[PDB]
Amino acid sequence: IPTVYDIYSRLLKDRIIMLGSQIDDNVANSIVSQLLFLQAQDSEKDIYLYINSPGGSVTAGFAIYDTIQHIKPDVQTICIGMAASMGSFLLAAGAKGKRFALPNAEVMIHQPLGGAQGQATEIEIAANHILKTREKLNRILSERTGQSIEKIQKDTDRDNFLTAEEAKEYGLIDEVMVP
Amino acid sequence: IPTVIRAYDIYSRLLKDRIIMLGSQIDDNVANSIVSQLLFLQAQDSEKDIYLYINSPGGSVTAGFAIYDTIQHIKPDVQTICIGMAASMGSFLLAAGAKGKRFALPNAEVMIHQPLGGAQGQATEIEIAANHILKTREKLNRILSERTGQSIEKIQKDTDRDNFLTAEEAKEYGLIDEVMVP
Amino acid sequence: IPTVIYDIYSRLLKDRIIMLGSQIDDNVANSIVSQLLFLQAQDSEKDIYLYINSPGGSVTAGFAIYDTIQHIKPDVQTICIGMAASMGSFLLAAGAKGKRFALPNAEVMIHQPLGGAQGQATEIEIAANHILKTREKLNRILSERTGQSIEKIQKDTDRDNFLTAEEAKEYGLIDEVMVPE
Amino acid sequence: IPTVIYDIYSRLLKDRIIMLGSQIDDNVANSIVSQLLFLQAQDSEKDIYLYINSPGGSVTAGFAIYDTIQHIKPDVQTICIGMAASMGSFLLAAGAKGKRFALPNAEVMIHQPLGGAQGQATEIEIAANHILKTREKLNRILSERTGQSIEKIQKDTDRDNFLTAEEAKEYGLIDEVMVPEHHHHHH
Amino acid sequence: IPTVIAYDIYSRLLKDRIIMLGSQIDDNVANSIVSQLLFLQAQDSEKDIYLYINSPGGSVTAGFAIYDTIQHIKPDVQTICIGMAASMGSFLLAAGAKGKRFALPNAEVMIHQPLGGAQGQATEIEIAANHILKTREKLNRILSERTGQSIEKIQKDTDRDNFLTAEEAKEYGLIDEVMVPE
Amino acid sequence: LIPTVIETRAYDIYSRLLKDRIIMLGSQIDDNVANSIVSQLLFLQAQDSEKDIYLYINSPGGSVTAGFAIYDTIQHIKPDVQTICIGMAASMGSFLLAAGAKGKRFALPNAEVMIHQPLGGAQGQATEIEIAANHILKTREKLNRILSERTGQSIEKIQKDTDRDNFLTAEEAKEYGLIDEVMVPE
Amino acid sequence: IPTVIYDIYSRLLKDRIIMLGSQIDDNVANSIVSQLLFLQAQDSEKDIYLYINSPGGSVTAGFAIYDTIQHIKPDVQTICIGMAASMGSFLLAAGAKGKRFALPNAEVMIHQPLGGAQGQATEIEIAANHILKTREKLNRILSERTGQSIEKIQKDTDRDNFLTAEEAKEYGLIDEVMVP
Amino acid sequence: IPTVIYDIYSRLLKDRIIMLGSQIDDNVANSIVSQLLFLQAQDSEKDIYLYINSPGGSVTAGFAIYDTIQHIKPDVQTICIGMAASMGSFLLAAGAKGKRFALPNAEVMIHQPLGGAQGQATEIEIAANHILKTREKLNRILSERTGQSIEKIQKDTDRDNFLTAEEAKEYGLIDEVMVP
Amino acid sequence: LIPTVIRAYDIYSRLLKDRIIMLGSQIDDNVANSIVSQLLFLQAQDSEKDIYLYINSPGGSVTAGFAIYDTIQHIKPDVQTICIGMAASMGSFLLAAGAKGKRFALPNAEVMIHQPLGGAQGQATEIEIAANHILKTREKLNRILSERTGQSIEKIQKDTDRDNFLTAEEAKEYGLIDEVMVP
């Protein structure tokens, strides 16, 4: 982590947040904290969320998602390298018209992953829970992309890799960012 | 394992007298052995009673149903006798014995509960696994109802959590017919 | 991790925001208790804001936080973001009356305490009596805090019970779903 | 394994009964192939009985059994007891026409083949092509054996598909569900 | 394991109606001993059986499998403690035919309350606690019947590890006689 | 994990509390923890020999000797040491709770206090086992005598009540004499 | 890491030098992307120097760096020192035209992408198709950057292909061997 | 184990020779107890010969063997070959009076019992009392078998006490050193 | 997590400013090196003022302990020793090494003395050398302990054959300390 401020701290000064890892609670807590801080500094100026992430925890993803929608500033999203799973969800959650990917960036969508062990009743509860979570994700993706819930369901049944151009056509981003 | 003398290990000697020992966790190996023994004993004599000793914590449901189905299939009555413990699929098999010939010894423990399992992967895979174990439970409960004379509704309630029964309670419940007195 | 002009968490603490963003253990509880006591000393009148994104954890560590909240003079707002499960949802419900919040897609889960015991029968008995008393304590406070009967709380926490933000509001675990500003 | 004055499995083999009661690997396949060939040599006309309680296993091992069954003259009856999954359900369906059975509470599961591949892109490609060809081969034979279309088999095996004995019969994986008087010779 | 002519040494002792419980009690051991007891009854319903006990104890349900089989069969089962009988081992020592429970002079007898475990939800812990407490009550009641001591005294005396000499075990009522040299 | 505070100097939160004479015993008691707490007690006495010190206890207990390092330092120094149980005080933790200045031992309402007999181990020769047994028995006699003095309960009662794990509510800890007061909200 | 009064790496960044001296993963990509952004913001006209001593690593992480290089205004010079293998050599070739360098004894290796897949046939199919497409993408860009045909790139990357600095130049992966 | 036309050990048992050639655990004790009772049943008058090459082991398992020796009618000769340590040397001393032997270079070691305890103070107390009572029992019987005082045995077993065969004879652990 | 006092010191450094050294761990070479360095520094600051060595230690390395012992004896200032919690083995040896009249324990502190521990593997000759070494070391420890306590070497040898736990009061009567420090 080079110094100038460490490099990430320096970027944050210019309202740039870097989501560059698996999404877990720690990452979500930091990005939530950064979003709230930037709102407090200036409630009008755009924020820039860089996304290079293979995804991760859905609830941690939703911590970031809800904070983005809560605050006043537009949050631009820029996919660089890869946005997969909850990462592609957050990519699609950026301000309308301000969701971007660079030309060689990859976007992947798939259904949520999980686990359950124990009694039949416990398995049932866990199964109902991840199914409801999927419905929730699909509903929001539908609203964000313009695709039907039915299409999202079908298209996320297995790993679905998209180019930046394909992500744009899908409605996950608004624009491929040109040199 | 002791030998008796015609030289038999003790278990083989009991089998000569139509006694089968289910004395471990139920897995596919155990089921294959017990199924083989049942089919052998039917061939040896299609009419004479078979005696199935049960000291088991249960195990695989499918392995258990291998034994269950073979018992119901063959012509001989299969007596069941709980000694020590019959839990889960073990208690299911105890209840599967010929009507009137299901026993426990006085200090034997019988435990009933819902089936256990696991699933990891995609939501759709979790769904399939969940639906499978729920159907499995419905299947078990339906047969338990038929074998005990209890309603399915009561079986469901009574198996929600671990439910330990004395021999005498197992009799009242309809899991066995009699407590075998000295 | 990032720094401003303060690490980001310390910067939020300057504005009376405490982040409960992990499993609750004694270390987390000690930290949050300390922050709560400091904030009271700095300003006994201004509200405090407790962010909760937690799968829960130690009950006694949870009660450390709970008792400090109730002890101090300032109102402690609770805001569920991401997930509040188990002792996490308990603390969510323990916020100042009228100032318990969840964001729209936040998840709230309630269930019964988990534990373990091994040894002699008498030791198992002691352990069982303990966790049962702990559950009664938890359920009574939840009853008081939500307006639900103890009997309903008992039934509703028998197994894992997942609630949406709106359901958590209807239940009385929170007062309001926080809508976009 | 108890003894009868023969270990129990050997005693059953005497009556032309083969027990497939485990995961299918090369050892299991070598054993069953040898038993089939032996039984044919003893008597080329009498039926053989293949018991199946198996979660499946190796596809190549399974095809060793499959091909030996179809090679020998005797009919090989199949009976599912407990569970027949994956390659196990394939072998269940490979029994002599009219002589494939399941007991009432037996479980039958069908799904697509599982595998792995690591290394260079071209190596991954080769592995992918190989398992995809293997699936086509399995599906074609299942189609012939069940009377279901390849298209239906493909759709039905995309994920784990659990069938009851009765469902397996209507699917054509088996021919019949084996269903179960007073006397005074009980003792 | 040496051979005699062809018997392994233990099988030779079984020929003379001697069963060796010389290990921790688990389901496998219980199944073996049960099988031996039933075989010996079938061989001769009237001649005494000798159960050698050198055991630190083990599974209570496994122990009860042995216990109930002893009480069920017609022949008297003598018990002889050699080395150590602890826990379920001492329970089975006490379960021998009245007047035919023995220990050799330097044999050790230890009684204590049952051990176990529980994890999971409070309700699950409660179920496990009620179960082991009921098991202890069952053990204590039978020990009371077998020793002539009150249930309350058994409870106190098994609260922690309680080591007895052979003579002390006789005075307690766990055995009838200390077997002195020939 | 540990946030910083800045006033008109920069402090980690724990250092800031120490500035106001608050010491945190918030972990298992071992030699390192005891060393830190002893050092803090000495320092605070030196800073002011008359002003109260506040010892927060959220601890499952731990080393008896390490506990006695803290105990003896509390008794040695001139300032009253208030004890405040928050979360849990168990074993040596509850011993130190009971060790606070008379009238200034507290617990918050849902704090858990647990008392039991000391734990230990010994392996090797019979005579080595004997030495270890005599040691832990003497140690228990020492603990119980002090507990008796601190609570007003008889040694006989303490012996009985610590035979196995004994979970007390804050209110029960007060009636037992382990604390003086259940701390009500400010 | 020595200090200058800056740690050494921070000191080099002050003079618009970025050090890629490890395996390429997401964390490394994130750092280099950030440095590239920062240096653009400091001065959009002055050249940036990217040192490459890397065995390669994540293709997606490498494309984060690749795309950021092509996005920003400043020319990014690339200098291979020690080794540039796999995605490392890809990024070496991605430097500003006329400003891709290697020192005389630096090693350059090109090969096809590596990966893995396990599970159902259809999952293996998806993984296979993905890495094959990734290889097409890599090869197409290499073709554009080197001036070699896609067909030649495919052949030459079928197995590990070690090049000297001089060989890398005549291949078109670099423009010049930096001579003492 | 070679075969004779019997495994070698079974052949020796035919001539009333029992091999205690390992650590003493419950399995070993059960086997030896069984052999002793069998040999008594075969002939209640003829001597038995117990070979001892053992580092000792479980005290209770040792007492299983000990009590069986004293119980049966036949004299049980003991012959230490190689090493008899701890419970091994206790059993050596337990042979029929006048018929306890060691070969010249055999090693005899006596020491106090080993054990362990963990948990609550009162549990440690119970375990301590137990092992102390066991040592009193061992020492009382050793005293009876050797003619040495309980006080002397206590002192001599405080730590590992290695004896030659000749020293074992003067100690009273054996009667005779068996000469070629 | 060591707290800071503010001129910003961690708590241990703050105590060192008042000439208090804290030995609160197993004695190894690192611990000895630090304590030796502290003793030297304090002597350099002021060669006349007392130093205070707090001891809560289960002991450890004999040679490390002797690095501390020798440095205490070498420097001009009196080094007081105060046993808090536990002083075992080499820890109790260092407690006894304090300036005469200035060795203390708090009332519930525990002092344990025993013989040194060690190990040896290899050839008979190597075992012999190791044995002779540890036996010499014990003679050295016992002789110094005799000088420090006023007890005979013969008594020290007997009393250290096995773990010997002393109360603070007993440690005083034994001569390991001068005084039990009363509140």
Ligand SMILES: O=C1[C@H](Cc2cnc[nH]2)N2C(=O)CCN(C(=O)NCc3ccccc3)[C@H]2CN1Cc1cccc2ccccc12
């Ligand atoms: O789309 C934009 C635009 C594009 C722009 C215009 N002029 C320079 N860059 N933008 C702004 O309009 C203001 C903030 N900003 C700065 O660079 N600000 C300067 C700066 C200062 C200190 C450190 C870093 C950057 C950028 C951030 N992003 C999003 C962005 C985020 C993360 C990584 C990226 C990689 C490649 C392209 C975009 C990226």
Ligand SMILES: O=C1[C@H](Cc2cnc[nH]2)N2C(=O)CCN(C(=O)NCc3ccccc3)[C@H]2CN1Cc1cccc2ccccc12
């Ligand atoms: O409910 C509130 C309200 C909401 C508000 C009103 N005006 C701005 N925000 N609130 C206050 O009323 C004062 C303190 N504060 C600041 O933002 N203060 C400004 C600030 C300064 C410096 C750093 C960060 C924030 C917030 C904290 N929270 C709780 C809270 C915690 C953590 C993460 C959250 C994410 C989303 C919503 C809420 C969050």
Ligand SMILES: O=C1[C@H](Cc2cnc[nH]2)N2C(=O)CCN(C(=O)NCc3ccccc3)[C@H]2CN1Cc1cccc2ccccc12
């Ligand atoms: O379906 C059949 C038929 C019909 C039949 C007769 N009794 C039950 N089912 N069959 C024959 O017609 C000849 C061979 N045979 C014998 O039982 N032969 C007698 C015998 C002798 C010695 C040992 C075992 C069995 C059986 C074998 N099988 C297949 C089979 C295999 C394995 C386990 C099974 C469990 C349950 C039902 C069938 C099973």
Ligand SMILES: O=C1[C@H](Cc2cnc[nH]2)N2C(=O)CCN(C(=O)NCc3ccccc3)[C@H]2CN1Cc1cccc2ccccc12
């Ligand atoms: O009982 C008390 C009393 C109670 C009081 C009276 N007015 C405010 N609080 N007390 C003092 O009388 C002086 C020191 N102090 C401060 O708060 N001082 C102010 C301060 C300044 C800077 C940081 C923290 C605290 C408190 C500490 N404690 C003990 C204590 C310790 C740890 C955590 C606790 C959590 C809940 C209750 C008590 C706690």
Ligand SMILES: O=C1[C@H](Cc2cnc[nH]2)N2C(=O)CCN(C(=O)NCc3ccccc3)[C@H]2CN1Cc1cccc2ccccc12
């Ligand atoms: O190709 C042949 C030929 C031709 C043949 C095929 N079916 C019957 N005959 N052959 C002989 O001409 C003599 C030996 N033999 C017997 O079966 N002999 C009878 C016999 C007796 C006893 C035990 C086993 C087999 C066979 C062995 N093989 C090779 C072979 C090996 C292993 C498994 C096989 C499975 C399927 C086909 C071939 C197999």
Ligand SMILES: O=C1[C@H](Cc2cnc[nH]2)N2C(=O)CCN(C(=O)NCc3ccccc3)[C@H]2CN1Cc1cccc2ccccc12
């Ligand atoms: O309930 C019965 C009845 C009734 C009976 C007669 N004597 C004891 N019980 N029964 C028969 O009617 C014929 C077969 N049989 C023999 O003992 N047969 C004799 C024999 C011969 C050779 C070896 C063993 C047993 C018994 C088996 N069982 C079931 C049984 C199984 C396993 C362990 C048990 C332990 C305790 C009680 C029952 C047990």
Ligand SMILES: O=C1[C@H](Cc2cnc[nH]2)N2C(=O)CCN(C(=O)NCc3ccccc3)[C@H]2CN1Cc1cccc2ccccc12
């Ligand atoms: O015996 C003494 C005496 C006793 C005294 C006098 N006034 C207060 N205490 N003493 C001095 O005479 C000068 C140095 N000093 C300070 O405390 N100085 C003040 C101070 C300043 C800064 C930080 C801490 C303490 C103390 C150190 N020790 C030794 C000592 C060491 C370690 C831990 C101990 C725990 C309990 C008792 C003693 C301890």
Ligand SMILES: O=C1[C@H](Cc2cnc[nH]2)N2C(=O)CCN(C(=O)NCc3ccccc3)[C@H]2CN1Cc1cccc2ccccc12
């Ligand atoms: O002291 C004796 C004497 C000595 C004797 C006299 N003639 C031969 N040997 N003795 C008997 O008086 C009868 C039994 N016996 C046989 O050798 N019997 C013959 C035999 C037959 C088959 C296998 C082994 C031995 C021996 C056993 N022992 C004890 C003994 C035990 C174990 C190992 C020993 C090693 C060395 C010396 C003694 C040993």
Ligand SMILES: O=C1[C@H](Cc2cnc[nH]2)N2C(=O)CCN(C(=O)NCc3ccccc3)[C@H]2CN1Cc1cccc2ccccc12
């Ligand atoms: O108490 C008895 C009684 C009385 C008796 C006779 N001699 C010694 N004790 N008993 C019989 O009345 C018939 C069966 N039997 C034989 O020895 N039978 C002879 C025999 C033949 C073949 C092999 C072994 C033993 C003995 C078994 N036991 C129990 C017993 C079990 C195990 C190990 C023991 C060790 C020491 C004492 C007793 C032991």
Ligand SMILES: O=C1[C@H](Cc2cnc[nH]2)N2C(=O)CCN(C(=O)NCc3ccccc3)[C@H]2CN1Cc1cccc2ccccc12
């Ligand atoms: O032999 C010497 C001599 C003699 C001396 C020792 N004590 C007083 N005088 N010496 C000097 O003549 C100049 C440097 N110095 C200081 O102490 N200087 C003062 C000082 C200032 C600040 C910090 C530490 C020491 C010492 C260092 N050494 C070597 C030495 C090294 C390391 C640890 C030792 C431990 C014990 C003895 C010697 C040690």
Ligand SMILES: [Mg+2]
């Ligand atoms: Mg916004």
Ligand SMILES: [Mg+2]
């Ligand atoms: Mg039947």
Ligand SMILES: [Mg+2]
């Ligand atoms: Mg409040």
Ligand SMILES: [Mg+2]
């Ligand atoms: Mg055929």
Ligand SMILES: [Mg+2]
């Ligand atoms: Mg009987």
Ligand SMILES: [Mg+2]
């Ligand atoms: Mg005080």
